[PDB]
Amino acid sequence: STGSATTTPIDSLDDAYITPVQIGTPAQTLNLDFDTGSSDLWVFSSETTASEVDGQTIYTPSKSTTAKLLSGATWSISYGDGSSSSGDVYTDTVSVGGLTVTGQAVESAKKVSSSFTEDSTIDGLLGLAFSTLNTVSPTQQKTFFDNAKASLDSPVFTADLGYHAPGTYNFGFIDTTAYTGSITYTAVSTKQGFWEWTSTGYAVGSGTFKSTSIDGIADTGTTLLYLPATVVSAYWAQVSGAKSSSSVGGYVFPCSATLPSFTFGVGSARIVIPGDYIDFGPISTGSSSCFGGIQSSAGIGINIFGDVALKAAFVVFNGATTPTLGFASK
Fold first, then answer.
1. How many Cα neighbours within 13 Å face the side chain of 27?
2. CATH no. of 5-174
3. How many Å apart are CA 80 and CA 73, to the nearest integer?
4. Catalytic one among 14, 33, 35, 307?
5. Catalytic residue among 199, 261, 296, 297
6. Is 160 among the catalytic positions?
7. CATH topology of domain 175-330
8. CA dihedral for 304, 306, 312, 317, sign (positive or negative)
Protein backbone atom coordinates (compact mmCIF):
# COMPACT_ATOMS: atom_id res chain seq x y z
CA SER A 1 0.00 0.00 0.00
CA THR A 2 0.92 3.67 -0.17
CA GLY A 3 -0.46 7.01 0.98
CA SER A 4 0.03 10.58 -0.15
CA ALA A 5 -1.23 13.68 1.66
CA THR A 6 -0.72 17.40 1.17
CA THR A 7 0.71 19.34 4.11
CA THR A 8 -0.04 23.08 4.40
CA PRO A 9 1.64 25.86 6.41
CA ILE A 10 -0.57 27.12 9.26
CA ASP A 11 0.43 30.74 8.72
CA SER A 12 2.48 33.12 6.58
CA LEU A 13 5.72 32.28 8.44
CA ASP A 14 5.56 28.47 8.03
CA ASP A 15 5.41 28.17 11.83
CA ALA A 16 4.10 24.60 11.39
CA TYR A 17 2.40 22.41 8.81
CA ILE A 18 -0.95 20.63 9.05
CA THR A 19 -2.04 17.53 7.20
CA PRO A 20 -5.63 16.22 7.06
CA VAL A 21 -6.15 12.84 8.78
CA GLN A 22 -9.31 10.73 8.76
CA ILE A 23 -10.19 9.14 12.11
CA GLY A 24 -13.09 6.82 12.87
CA THR A 25 -16.21 5.65 11.05
CA PRO A 26 -17.75 7.69 9.52
CA ALA A 27 -14.53 9.64 9.01
CA GLN A 28 -13.78 12.61 11.24
CA THR A 29 -11.16 14.73 9.52
CA LEU A 30 -8.71 16.52 11.80
CA ASN A 31 -5.72 18.61 10.73
CA LEU A 32 -2.67 17.21 12.51
CA ASP A 33 0.91 18.37 12.85
CA PHE A 34 3.10 15.51 11.59
CA ASP A 35 6.01 15.44 14.02
CA THR A 36 9.10 13.34 13.32
CA GLY A 37 10.34 14.46 16.77
CA SER A 38 7.72 12.58 18.83
CA SER A 39 5.76 9.33 18.79
CA ASP A 40 2.22 10.03 20.04
CA LEU A 41 -0.85 10.53 17.86
CA TRP A 42 -3.00 12.78 20.03
CA VAL A 43 -6.07 14.86 19.26
CA PHE A 44 -8.34 17.51 20.65
CA SER A 45 -11.50 15.65 21.52
CA SER A 46 -14.93 15.64 23.14
CA GLU A 47 -13.00 14.89 26.35
CA THR A 48 -10.75 17.97 26.25
CA THR A 49 -11.38 20.45 29.08
CA ALA A 50 -13.75 22.97 27.47
CA SER A 51 -11.78 26.02 28.60
CA GLU A 52 -8.73 24.65 26.76
CA VAL A 53 -10.42 24.31 23.35
CA ASP A 54 -10.40 27.42 21.07
CA GLY A 55 -11.52 26.77 17.50
CA GLN A 56 -9.97 23.32 16.99
CA THR A 57 -11.87 20.49 15.37
CA ILE A 58 -12.40 17.70 17.89
CA TYR A 59 -12.52 13.92 17.66
CA THR A 60 -15.66 12.46 19.24
CA PRO A 61 -15.09 8.75 19.80
CA SER A 62 -18.73 8.15 20.78
CA LYS A 63 -19.70 9.03 17.18
CA SER A 64 -17.28 6.47 15.69
CA THR A 65 -18.57 2.92 15.23
CA THR A 66 -14.98 1.62 15.14
CA ALA A 67 -13.70 3.43 18.28
CA LYS A 68 -12.86 1.31 21.33
CA LEU A 69 -11.58 2.55 24.67
CA LEU A 70 -8.12 1.14 25.35
CA SER A 71 -9.09 0.35 28.90
CA GLY A 72 -6.72 1.60 31.59
CA ALA A 73 -4.36 3.35 29.21
CA THR A 74 -3.28 6.94 29.82
CA TRP A 75 -0.72 9.23 28.21
CA SER A 76 1.16 12.38 29.12
CA ILE A 77 3.75 14.19 27.06
CA SER A 78 6.00 17.16 27.69
CA TYR A 79 7.70 18.56 24.62
CA GLY A 80 11.16 20.10 24.68
CA ASP A 81 9.74 23.61 24.34
CA GLY A 82 7.62 23.24 27.49
CA SER A 83 4.28 22.47 25.87
CA SER A 84 2.27 19.48 27.09
CA SER A 85 -0.88 17.41 26.80
CA SER A 86 -2.39 14.32 28.42
CA GLY A 87 -5.43 12.10 28.49
CA ASP A 88 -6.76 8.61 27.74
CA VAL A 89 -6.67 6.35 24.69
CA TYR A 90 -8.96 4.84 22.07
CA THR A 91 -8.14 2.55 19.20
CA ASP A 92 -9.75 3.47 15.90
CA THR A 93 -9.26 3.43 12.15
CA VAL A 94 -6.90 6.15 10.93
CA SER A 95 -6.24 7.06 7.30
CA VAL A 96 -3.64 9.41 5.84
CA GLY A 97 -3.74 10.18 2.13
CA GLY A 98 -5.51 6.93 1.29
CA LEU A 99 -3.39 4.71 3.57
CA THR A 100 -5.45 3.05 6.32
CA VAL A 101 -4.39 1.61 9.66
CA THR A 102 -6.92 -0.27 11.76
CA GLY A 103 -6.46 -0.42 15.52
CA GLN A 104 -4.35 2.75 15.71
CA ALA A 105 -3.94 4.21 19.18
CA VAL A 106 -5.63 7.61 19.13
CA GLU A 107 -4.71 9.53 22.26
CA SER A 108 -7.62 11.69 23.36
CA ALA A 109 -6.56 14.87 25.17
CA LYS A 110 -8.20 15.70 28.46
CA LYS A 111 -5.74 18.55 29.03
CA VAL A 112 -3.54 20.64 26.75
CA SER A 113 -1.13 23.48 27.50
CA SER A 114 -1.87 27.06 26.46
CA SER A 115 0.32 26.95 23.34
CA PHE A 116 -1.90 24.22 21.88
CA THR A 117 -5.10 26.02 22.88
CA GLU A 118 -3.80 29.15 21.16
CA ASP A 119 -2.94 27.32 17.90
CA SER A 120 -6.51 27.18 16.47
CA THR A 121 -5.24 25.55 13.28
CA ILE A 122 -3.67 22.45 14.90
CA ASP A 123 -6.14 19.74 15.94
CA GLY A 124 -3.44 17.44 17.32
CA LEU A 125 -0.09 15.84 16.54
CA LEU A 126 0.83 12.68 14.62
CA GLY A 127 4.17 11.38 15.84
CA LEU A 128 6.61 9.85 13.37
CA ALA A 129 9.65 9.25 15.58
CA PHE A 130 10.40 5.75 16.89
CA SER A 131 7.72 4.00 18.91
CA THR A 132 10.09 3.65 21.86
CA LEU A 133 9.24 7.31 22.68
CA ASN A 134 5.49 6.70 22.82
CA THR A 135 4.10 7.80 26.19
CA VAL A 136 1.09 5.50 26.59
CA SER A 137 1.07 3.62 29.90
CA PRO A 138 1.02 0.84 30.96
CA THR A 139 1.16 -0.57 27.42
CA GLN A 140 3.29 1.49 25.03
CA GLN A 141 1.69 1.99 21.61
CA LYS A 142 3.01 2.09 18.05
CA THR A 143 3.08 5.08 15.71
CA PHE A 144 0.95 5.25 12.60
CA PHE A 145 4.08 4.59 10.51
CA ASP A 146 5.11 1.56 12.54
CA ASN A 147 1.62 0.11 12.29
CA ALA A 148 1.50 0.76 8.54
CA LYS A 149 5.03 -0.42 7.79
CA ALA A 150 4.51 -4.08 6.96
CA SER A 151 1.72 -3.22 4.52
CA LEU A 152 3.68 -0.48 2.76
CA ASP A 153 5.29 -1.16 -0.60
CA SER A 154 8.55 0.10 0.95
CA PRO A 155 9.12 0.83 4.68
CA VAL A 156 9.60 4.57 4.17
CA PHE A 157 7.89 7.92 4.40
CA THR A 158 9.03 11.19 2.83
CA ALA A 159 8.69 14.84 3.87
CA ASP A 160 8.58 17.47 1.15
CA LEU A 161 7.78 20.68 2.99
CA GLY A 162 7.12 23.88 1.05
CA TYR A 163 8.50 27.36 1.61
CA HIS A 164 5.43 29.56 2.03
CA ALA A 165 3.55 26.86 0.09
CA PRO A 166 1.99 23.44 0.50
CA GLY A 167 4.04 20.27 0.29
CA THR A 168 3.61 16.53 0.64
CA TYR A 169 3.99 13.56 2.99
CA ASN A 170 4.20 10.24 1.15
CA PHE A 171 4.10 6.80 2.75
CA GLY A 172 5.48 3.65 1.17
CA PHE A 173 7.17 5.07 -1.94
CA ILE A 174 9.74 7.59 -3.11
CA ASP A 175 8.42 10.04 -5.73
CA THR A 176 11.37 10.35 -8.09
CA THR A 177 9.77 13.41 -9.77
CA ALA A 178 9.82 15.36 -6.49
CA TYR A 179 13.56 16.11 -6.27
CA THR A 180 16.57 17.03 -8.40
CA GLY A 181 19.84 15.11 -8.61
CA SER A 182 20.30 12.13 -6.33
CA ILE A 183 19.27 11.31 -2.76
CA THR A 184 22.21 11.03 -0.36
CA TYR A 185 21.57 8.62 2.50
CA THR A 186 23.16 8.90 5.91
CA ALA A 187 23.18 6.72 9.02
CA VAL A 188 20.61 7.07 11.80
CA SER A 189 20.94 6.36 15.51
CA THR A 190 17.71 5.30 17.20
CA LYS A 191 19.33 5.27 20.66
CA GLN A 192 17.33 8.31 21.85
CA GLY A 193 14.23 7.41 19.81
CA PHE A 194 14.73 10.19 17.27
CA TRP A 195 15.74 10.36 13.62
CA GLU A 196 19.23 11.27 14.79
CA TRP A 197 22.04 11.72 12.30
CA THR A 198 25.35 13.52 11.81
CA SER A 199 25.77 16.38 9.38
CA THR A 200 29.24 16.68 7.85
CA GLY A 201 29.51 20.46 8.15
CA TYR A 202 28.29 23.84 7.01
CA ALA A 203 28.91 26.98 5.01
CA VAL A 204 27.60 30.54 5.38
CA GLY A 205 26.60 32.24 2.13
CA SER A 206 29.33 31.86 -0.50
CA GLY A 207 31.92 31.08 2.17
CA THR A 208 34.12 28.03 2.41
CA PHE A 209 32.64 24.79 3.73
CA LYS A 210 33.68 23.87 7.26
CA SER A 211 34.02 20.10 7.72
CA THR A 212 32.75 19.31 11.20
CA SER A 213 30.44 16.66 12.64
CA ILE A 214 27.10 18.02 13.85
CA ASP A 215 24.84 15.44 15.49
CA GLY A 216 21.17 16.38 15.42
CA ILE A 217 17.62 15.26 14.80
CA ALA A 218 15.37 15.63 11.78
CA ASP A 219 12.28 17.16 13.39
CA THR A 220 9.35 18.24 11.23
CA GLY A 221 7.56 19.41 14.39
CA THR A 222 10.12 22.15 15.15
CA THR A 223 9.94 25.42 13.23
CA LEU A 224 13.55 26.57 13.24
CA LEU A 225 17.10 25.29 12.79
CA TYR A 226 18.93 24.96 16.12
CA LEU A 227 22.70 24.45 15.90
CA PRO A 228 25.77 24.86 18.12
CA ALA A 229 26.52 28.40 19.29
CA THR A 230 29.78 28.49 17.30
CA VAL A 231 27.98 27.73 14.03
CA VAL A 232 25.14 30.14 14.71
CA SER A 233 27.49 32.97 15.68
CA ALA A 234 29.44 32.46 12.42
CA TYR A 235 26.16 32.75 10.48
CA TRP A 236 24.83 35.91 12.14
CA ALA A 237 28.23 37.62 12.04
CA GLN A 238 27.62 37.94 8.27
CA VAL A 239 24.44 39.99 8.79
CA SER A 240 25.00 43.68 9.60
CA GLY A 241 23.32 44.64 12.85
CA ALA A 242 22.39 41.11 13.87
CA LYS A 243 22.66 40.29 17.57
CA SER A 244 21.49 37.84 20.17
CA SER A 245 18.80 39.37 22.33
CA SER A 246 18.11 37.76 25.69
CA SER A 247 14.96 39.89 26.00
CA VAL A 248 13.56 38.54 22.72
CA GLY A 249 14.98 35.03 23.18
CA GLY A 250 17.47 34.64 20.35
CA TYR A 251 19.12 36.20 17.35
CA VAL A 252 17.38 39.14 15.74
CA PHE A 253 18.42 41.17 12.74
CA PRO A 254 17.42 44.43 11.07
CA CYS A 255 14.46 43.83 8.79
CA SER A 256 16.31 45.88 6.14
CA ALA A 257 18.97 43.15 5.85
CA THR A 258 19.48 40.67 3.06
CA LEU A 259 20.22 37.28 4.63
CA PRO A 260 22.91 34.93 3.35
CA SER A 261 22.15 31.30 2.59
CA PHE A 262 23.20 28.48 4.91
CA THR A 263 24.54 25.18 3.61
CA PHE A 264 24.61 21.91 5.57
CA GLY A 265 26.43 18.73 4.66
CA VAL A 266 24.89 15.31 4.18
CA GLY A 267 27.83 13.02 3.54
CA SER A 268 29.62 14.55 0.55
CA ALA A 269 26.39 16.26 -0.57
CA ARG A 270 25.21 19.76 0.31
CA ILE A 271 21.77 21.19 1.04
CA VAL A 272 21.43 24.96 0.58
CA ILE A 273 18.91 26.85 2.67
CA PRO A 274 18.16 30.15 0.89
CA GLY A 275 18.49 33.31 2.97
CA ASP A 276 14.77 34.05 2.64
CA TYR A 277 13.95 30.82 4.52
CA ILE A 278 15.81 32.19 7.56
CA ASP A 279 13.57 35.29 7.85
CA PHE A 280 10.80 34.92 10.46
CA GLY A 281 9.70 38.52 10.24
CA PRO A 282 9.12 41.27 12.77
CA ILE A 283 9.45 40.26 16.42
CA SER A 284 6.18 42.12 17.04
CA THR A 285 3.79 43.78 14.60
CA GLY A 286 5.36 46.88 13.08
CA SER A 287 8.84 46.26 14.49
CA SER A 288 11.94 46.75 12.36
CA SER A 289 13.68 43.96 14.27
CA CYS A 290 13.20 40.58 12.64
CA PHE A 291 13.53 37.13 14.19
CA GLY A 292 16.15 34.74 12.83
CA GLY A 293 15.44 31.24 11.61
CA ILE A 294 18.78 29.85 12.75
CA GLN A 295 19.18 29.83 16.52
CA SER A 296 21.51 28.35 19.12
CA SER A 297 20.81 24.87 20.47
CA ALA A 298 22.75 25.67 23.66
CA GLY A 299 20.48 24.78 26.56
CA ILE A 300 18.30 22.48 24.44
CA GLY A 301 20.73 19.59 24.79
CA ILE A 302 20.39 18.52 21.15
CA ASN A 303 20.75 20.09 17.71
CA ILE A 304 17.50 20.25 15.75
CA PHE A 305 17.14 20.21 11.98
CA GLY A 306 13.65 21.68 12.04
CA ASP A 307 11.44 22.96 9.23
CA VAL A 308 13.84 25.73 8.16
CA ALA A 309 16.36 23.04 7.16
CA LEU A 310 14.01 20.28 6.08
CA LYS A 311 11.93 22.40 3.71
CA ALA A 312 15.07 23.06 1.65
CA ALA A 313 15.19 19.31 0.86
CA PHE A 314 13.26 16.26 -0.15
CA VAL A 315 13.75 14.04 2.92
CA VAL A 316 13.44 10.26 3.09
CA PHE A 317 12.76 8.66 6.46
CA ASN A 318 13.81 5.06 5.79
CA GLY A 319 12.32 2.76 8.43
CA ALA A 320 13.97 -0.44 7.21
CA THR A 321 15.55 -2.75 9.82
CA THR A 322 18.59 -0.46 9.79
CA PRO A 323 17.00 2.98 9.46
CA THR A 324 18.60 5.76 7.44
CA LEU A 325 17.79 9.31 6.34
CA GLY A 326 18.03 10.55 2.76
CA PHE A 327 18.31 14.14 1.56
CA ALA A 328 17.98 15.52 -1.95
CA SER A 329 17.83 19.03 -3.33
CA LYS A 330 14.60 20.05 -5.06
1. 13
2. 2.40.70.10
3. 23
4. 35
5. 199
6. no
7. Cathepsin D, subunit A; domain 1 (2.40.70)
8. positive
